[PDB]
Symmetry: D2
Subunit: 381 residues, 4 copies
């Protein structure tokens, strides 16, 4: 009766990413946060075990992992290092427009370099004046012969400066219809007129570089176009339907690491002559953390299976999975700090970092407010 | 990619129980509550379509439905009538000790009558002084030759007076070890010295009879014994591991009926010149209801698949599924009343009944407090 | 240091209403709910001790109680019988438009009969198509010589059929400006063309009659006019600023009765060899109930003192006090049922009635959704 | 009608501390957090306006501010800089044992230096193995002639290394009765054998030094004794009854600063062509923040008035006020980050610091779990 569980192959994958995460990523997580530096040790360990971008098709040299397998990878990394989990999460985000909409030529150019780990991808959608409202974006792409000229800026770009390739959405007709006047382009780190802003100083995922992209008359070839002129925002929304699920998986892993840590601690710490775990108020808090986490996990996996099949109700299930898991991770990490007492408030234990990291999952890949808008729309239509 | 969803056969089953529920059960639900009367129309409709006790093995004339199929049945009935949903839920509860522990003879005597719908089963575990603490039960069974003499009382017995057979747990050795001095027996409605208390006057599931069992020197044959002398409470705990999942399914169905009703209403009701559904605060409430309901549903189905396979972590997953779903149903039904305004507070709409019914799911089949104890124990061991 | 507490006189008043409530009201509360009948024993006890309408000025034969004293009265009654608490709460609601806007003649006609207890007042604002949106009300009043002719209907009217006088708001100019085309009138139970609908069948406050008013060409004298033609809705909003505070006080009293009952019970009930009160998970639930209740109480009293002084921020504080207290009462009463287990779900204990009653406090005197709208408006302006 | 509000004098005080806070403290708050450095600019501004230790009696050169005035001071500072708010909060904590239990001589020695601002006080109660369980503390004080010899360690000491005087509790008889074998002593920064641990690396209140005290055969005179030998822990518990209220006030101020910031931002930020404040889901979030904050504020002020009068129910009201306000501040600051979107997650806005700071209020001055224990005990006795 093989219902409502991952395959044996999924559980073998879980065990393999967990070994890489616990051995090679976990020891660097505190230093990555504390120095706000790219998790380079994690990148090398993930590249060596083909966990840096596992979703890429076997035809491009990739692992060809299904959406659920890719979720389990992001979850198991996020359990020890949220910054590291963004390597496969943002590699999928930046590549998904090519995978969903790109010509065979565009895919053949870029996906093999992702698969081999020679390049990371970033995704440039958000702006200073258009964050949630991406249809109002002002970055523009203008034909000049066979070339495109890009002018404007993207805000908040994960892995900027480390990524070699940038999937960028820009307005291709300022007079075209709202939502259907945008196109997607692959931009290279050394394209002319392309600079980075100063790294953002963040609450959490501090090792993950977060930087503005500045486009000053960036001239790129005509073959950088991903999909059809004007269909870029449709491609971006379709991308979001898959990638929101992976942030739900990230939220689940962060919450799981915090719960793992809190459970180990309250079994050992003694006060008033017994283990903290022996206090029934503590037992109720642990049961709440575990029940909500497990509900969030199963909902992420249901949305992941929907992502793999492209189920017609993926928008609802993905928006629900991402909003629920991030809300639950925020609550669980706030309680994991609580359960360690004073120790929990110090950077000598990892639970305060896990709480600071959990907060991003409620904001990026669609704010939980936008997620509630999307859910209500899917219910009422 | 057939992961994390019910089978096509499960969805055909869902459609068939939903037709019986909407056509034959739903029209009587208000009158069943209002007159506090047994849902007789629902019993006949369920018996005619073999949905009254679908878990019974095909070898006993039963449907042989898996634990997930049985959950979907209880859910789809509970969506229109919570009292009616207790026909298959309590038929499973009362029969499960026979199915888990009974001799071939005991099973052959009782299960065919359940399968055909000639008899309903009840489960007599709780008492006046031993509710949560069932190991402290005082009802006693004493050998008299080949017979057993039962003395005491059971409290809160669902379907009492309607059920023909009562699976009753009693102390078989007041000096034996705590938890291992109890045995299970099948008691018949016409066994001598066996009476019923006055029906309880309840907040909700008002059509479901709830009555004390009084045992005054009840003499029954030796072959009424279910399993081994002293193993009755082990059988009762094992039963609970499966049946808690079905109350989670009941909670999911009640919440789904309330959400279905609230969604239909806020699309039609207009205030300040627009549909109530057009207010973003309302949209956020609907998204919260739907997200939490969907998380509770997937968690119930994960626990149901664990029940079918007898997964070693069934205790955790069942306790989590039942506690989560009932907590979520309490919150959703309280908001469904809210969303109808004044109308919601009147018995002319069904959402106030759905709120009164939701509250029982937090109490029976282990209080949500006992569920948190069980969850914490499974985490810490 | 006499800061942040009621006066000694307030505490003497509290003790006096508590005696009347515990001796004369509490014994009838269950029967009042169970038979859905007016709390006549409570009315007579309240009239005999001048607690039926204590806010009326001493110049009209009244007690002249301040807004805080009147809150304490409603709270102490609502602790034992929510239906009874609506006698002074709705007596204030129906009289407040006369007190805020009425001529000396109108006040002199009606307030002495309220003060003596010869008449109760009702308030007719809501309609079938205009509940939250009262500015869209369709009930009309048309001059005919010195008379007014009323046509339409009011929905949900508390104490209808028992009250002698009805303060009714009606459109006095269907072409006048939105919100400034409505007037208030005193309607008598025996005015011609005036009938009542069938009593609503409610979730709770079942003894409180709730009935439609039907106006079929109701001819009333010109001197029935309360305040100025067109200022009726301004008077209604001003009324709401004071009366919302009294529903917050009602919510506090219902929650207090449920907590009083739960605390007494968990000290006595034993399971697993100790008092339920000895379980730390239970202690945490009790601390949550008590802390939230006490916060809600102090906020109601702060809003009551604002009501007495007519502080410029009364809208915010009243809306906050009513929304907070009713939300907290819903949560506390749902947990009070929980803490009694099975007993809590039966009508033999009062906590299920207290939960059914608590739910109305979130809906009437402005839904908690309208309260959040009002709060946000006061913050942002 | 002067009920349920601060005095005119309190509101003049509020305006005066708010000017010092907005002009002199607020500009340094970000740099204080970012460099984890003592808020020296705030200390000088507070000392110059007599807001560094306002509770000290006029007989010692102090302001003599009542407990409510002192709460308003801590609140108004905590609104702009939580680290700065600990100057008057910890000055009261460390001095309160002298004020409650000290001889006239001890008070005359130390309180004038606090009043003038020549010295800050710290409080040394907690240890590595005795945090919540202070009766199990192991730091010892041993008579040697007229001297005392202190040996052990205190953990988590706020303002350590900056404070000149340390009120330290130590075991004076390892064989005396539990809770009645502890005494309080004033320790000087230059007492022999007295060192500090390395500053803790914290989630928030990063400018507030937090350091272990190490006592290696610390010899101090007999006149350092505060109160009676063996009554130190009674003095510590009594201190906590007053000081918990001031952490509730701190939590209120942090939440108020976050709400002030979020409200200003959502009025200005536009998305989808309107102000964020114009979205009703946002309006509901703002109403929730404001209602809960206002309930927490009024409850803190009720507990403060109880602290001033020494009301017999101060334990309950203080524990409730501190637990409620800190829980509410955690929720409000987490939502204030949310409402700024990406900006909220960056250290360029202050709301992420306010969230990191809010988390300490749930842990120190008795964890919210200990607060629920204390509340339950006061309810059940
Ligand atoms: C660390 C970080 C990493 C990121 N990574 C990337 C990335 O790699 N690539 C990329 O393109 N983007 C990225 N983002 C951008 C992120 O998706 C945006 O911050 C988010 O979309 C919100 O936009 P905003 O920050 O402008 O907030 P705004 O859109 O200004 O929203 C502000 C507030 O208003 C609310 N709001 C907005 N619209 C509505 C509405 N219609 N109804 C109700 N409430 C509403 C929001 O929920 C929020 O609470 C990242 C963000 C951060 C902080
Ligand atoms: C309508 C209805 C139908 C029922 N149907 C059946 C049925 O068919 N057959 C049957 O045998 N039973 C049935 N039950 C019984 C039900 O399972 C019991 O009510 C439940 O087990 C609780 O027992 P109690 O009511 O005695 O509460 P108690 O056990 O007295 O508990 C009272 C309160 O204390 C809490 N509590 C108890 N122990 C602990 C602990 N260790 N830690 C923390 N908190 C604790 C509980 O959660 C509860 O909040 C039914 C109950 C009802 C009301
Ligand atoms: C038992 C009872 C007693 C009452 N007593 C009286 C009385 O004595 N006199 C009297 O005149 N009235 C009385 N009322 C009426 C009561 O005030 C109304 O029910 C209430 O105002 C809501 O109106 P409605 O029921 O038409 O709900 P609707 O206004 O139809 O609202 C339905 C739902 O939409 C929500 N909603 C409405 N507008 C908005 C908005 N702008 N933004 C977001 N959500 C919105 C509501 O909060 C609610 O959840 C009573 C009601 C009841 C049930
Ligand atoms: C930044 C900071 C500043 C501080 N300032 C000072 C100060 O100036 N002076 C000073 O003396 N102290 C100070 N403290 C100490 C603070 O009061 C302690 O951290 C707190 O008392 C908890 O002790 P602990 O950290 O050892 O946690 P523990 O006592 O080990 O508790 C760990 C967890 O168990 C829970 N727990 C403990 N006992 C029970 C129980 N009986 N029932 C249920 N749950 C329980 C706790 O709530 C917590 O969640 C400070 C702490 C910090 C972090």
């Amino acid at each position: 009766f093989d219902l409502y569980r991952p395959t044996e192959e999924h559980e073998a994958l879980r065990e393999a990413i967990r070994s890489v995460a616990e051995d090679k990523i976990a020891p660097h997580a505190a230093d990555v946060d504390e120095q706000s530096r790219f998790p380079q040790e994690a990148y090398e360990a993930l590249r060596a075990s083909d966990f840096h971008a596992p979703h890429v098709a076997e035809e491009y040299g990739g692992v060809g992992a299904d959406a659920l397998a890719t979720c389990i990878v992001i979850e198991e990394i996020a359990r020890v290092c949220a910054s590291s989990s963004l390597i496969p999460a943002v590699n999928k985000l930046g590549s998904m427009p090519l995978i969903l909409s790109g010509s065979d030529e565009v895919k053949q150019r870029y996906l093999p370099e992702l698969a081999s780990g020679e390049a990371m991808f970033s995704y440039g959608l958000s702006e200073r004046e258009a964050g949630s409202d991406t249809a109002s974006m002002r970055t523009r792409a203008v034909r000049d012969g066979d070339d495109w000229i890009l002018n404007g800026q993207k805000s908040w770009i994960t892995n900027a400066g480390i990524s070699k390739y940038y999937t960028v959405m820009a307005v291709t007709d300022p007079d075209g219809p709202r939502g259907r006047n945008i196109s997607a382009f692959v931009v290279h780190i050394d394209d002319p007129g392309f600079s980075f802003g100063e790294p953002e100083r963040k609450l959490g995922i501090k090792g993950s570089p977060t930087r503005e992209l500045i486009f000053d008359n960036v001239r790129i070839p005509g073959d950088r176009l991903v999909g059809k002129v004007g269909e870029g925002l449709r491609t971006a929304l379709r991308t979001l339907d898959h990638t929101r699920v992976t942030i739900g998986a990230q939220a689940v892993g962060i919450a799981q690491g915090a719960l793992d840590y809190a459970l180990g601690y309250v079994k050992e710490r003694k006060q008033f002559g017994k283990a903290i775990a022996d206090f029934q108020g503590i037992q109720f808090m642990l049961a709440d953390m575990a029940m909500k986490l497990e509900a969030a996990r199963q909902m992420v996996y249901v949305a992941a299976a929907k992502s793999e099949r492209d189920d017609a109700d993926l928008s609802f299930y993905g928006a629900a999975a991402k909003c629920f898991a991030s809300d639950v991770a925020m609550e669980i990490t706030t309680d994991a700090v609580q359960l360690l007492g004073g120790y929990g408030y110090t950077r000598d234990y990892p639970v305060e970092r896990m709480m600071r990291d959990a907060k991003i999952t409620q904001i990026y890949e669609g704010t939980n407010q936008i997620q509630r808008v999307v859910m209500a729309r899917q219910l009422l239509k």
